[PDB]
């Protein structure tokens, strides 16, 4: 007669169970029929960090299926713009043509994909509606004003290294209005595309189309969008007297804060969230009996890091909206019968 | 609208309305698993399970077997609605939290 409703207990030789006991018929009384108000009451989102290119909200009180749906949407279904075709007029570089096209596909563009649309199948030409064109034209020459020196930038250098700065947007249609001068640009100005020696030249036109990270990774808008369940650490016994420090070393260092309540030293669990699961207490043989570390049941921690095309919060919003769009597409196709 | 990027339903042996297999095209484990989680909350369904037919293909099979009365197409169309309601609520809550944090940080 003992219920544990909220944690995923764990030892070393394996974890105890894979359930969450929050579904219909999963208890004598604790049965579920998807009370929507109970959800709307027990759900809360907290936002720990939000630099540019980072977010770490909490998303407390949701199941693993919905959290995983959100994570898989950001990685593979939120749309981005990226180079699909490369027209090469001349290329006397050491970098091949196909390898140059590949390298150009993996460069992130700062166009927002919500103002564009998908190219129809076999729309090779493209129009202001679905495409953005950029041009890289660079040639390397020796600089006339150079002494007998060997630094590659000083001599043998007008364009020794071709960067993303060298790529220039060719406004395709009326896109010069709508897009102000600096808005459509590659996100990073320092990505090394190639290297040149005097007499070598690159000249090409790149076409960027819309697409999702599912049919090619180049179109994916986040470095990673993973999540982790909130750890839980409980001191079953008061640790003290120089075993507190050994305890504080078997964890990521901020988790067990050793206070000094009396002349003796007491270890306390200051911040369970910092913990990385390393299970190094389980090697102690005397303190594996003192601490129980498990996971909180439906308390997640998310971390979204965008490449630079869209801000992270906008990414999460568009992910939730893409899931809603899936649901609505299937609802309206069902209503079609 | 789309005759086959979307739904194809196969009523079972005897065309039992209470046992249907929906084929959802262009879907992977994301919608499959979230929708199966949302359809399991209905006490009127006795068996819900999804599965991907083959890696090379892009389509899932849901199987809903409901109790004696309802035609097993209401559980599906209600799991869809509840999942979309949950997504709308999560979106509202997340945007409100982001706004509140932006204000708290821009003030200080």
């Amino acid at each position: 007669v003992e219920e544990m409703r909220s944690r995923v207990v764990l030892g070393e030789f394996g974890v105890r169970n894979v359930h969450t006991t929050d579904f219909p018929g999963n208890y004598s009384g604790y049965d579920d029929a998807w009370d929507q108000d109970r959800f709307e009451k027990n759900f809360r989102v907290d936002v720990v960090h939000m630099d540019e290119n980072s977010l770490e909200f909490d998303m407390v009180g949701i199941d693993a299926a919905i959290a995983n749906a959100f994570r898989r949407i950001l990685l593979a279904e939120v749309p981005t713009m990226a180079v699909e075709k490369v027209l090469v007029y001349n290329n006397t570089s050491i970098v091949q043509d196909e390898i140059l096209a590949h390298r150009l596909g993996l460069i992130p563009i700062h166009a927002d994909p919500r103002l564009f649309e998908y190219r129809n199948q076999g729309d090779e030409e493209g129009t202001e509606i679905d495409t953005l064109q950029f041009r890289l034209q660079v040639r390397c020459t020796r600089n006339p004003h150079a002494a007998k020196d060997s630094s590659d930038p000083n001599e043998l250098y007008v364009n020794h290294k071709v960067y993303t700065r060298h790529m220039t947007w060719i406004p395709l249609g009326n896109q010069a209005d709508l897009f102000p001068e600096g808005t459509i640009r590659p996100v990073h100005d320092d990505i090394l595309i190639a290297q040149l020696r005097p007499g070598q030249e690159i000249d090409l036109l790149m076409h960027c189309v819309k697409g999702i990270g599912k049919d090619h990774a180049k179109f994916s808008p986040v470095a990673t969008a993973s999540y982790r369940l909130l750890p839980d650490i409980t001191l079953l016994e008061p640790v003290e007297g120089e075993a507190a420090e050994e305890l504080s070393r078997c964890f990521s260092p901020g988790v067990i804060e050793v206070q000094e309540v009396q002349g003796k030293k007491v270890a306390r669990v200051a911040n369970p969230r910092l913990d990385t699961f390393s299970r190094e207490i389980f090697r102690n043989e005397k303190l594996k009996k003192v601490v129980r570390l498990a996971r909180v049941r439906d308390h997640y921690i998310f971390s979204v890091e965008s490449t630079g095309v869209l801000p992270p919060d906008v990414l999460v919003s568009e992910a939730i909206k893409v899931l809603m769009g899936k649901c609505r597409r299937f609802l309206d196709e069902l209503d079609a019968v | 609208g789309e005759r086959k990027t979307a739904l194809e339903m196969v009523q079972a042996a005897g065309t039992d309305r209470h046992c249907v297999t929906f084929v959802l095209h262009e879907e992977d484990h994301t919608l499959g698993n979230s929708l199966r989680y949302m359809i399991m909350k209905n006490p009127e369904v006795e068996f819900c399970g999804y599965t991907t037919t083959h890696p090379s293909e892009s389509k899932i099979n849901l199987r809903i077997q409901t109790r004696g009365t309802l035609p097993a197409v209401e559980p599906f169309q209600r799991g869809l609605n509840e999942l979309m309601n949950v997504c709308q609520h999560v979106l509202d809550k997340f945007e409100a939290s982001i706004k509140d944090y932006k204000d708290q940080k821009a003030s200080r």
């Binding site: 907290d46 936002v47 720990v48 960090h49 909490d58 911040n271 969230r273 910092l274 | 944090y101 708290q104 940080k105």
Partner: peptide, 5 residues
């Protein structure tokens, strides 16, 4: 590290 203060 710790949701917003």
């Amino acid at each position: 590290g710790n949701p917003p203060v």
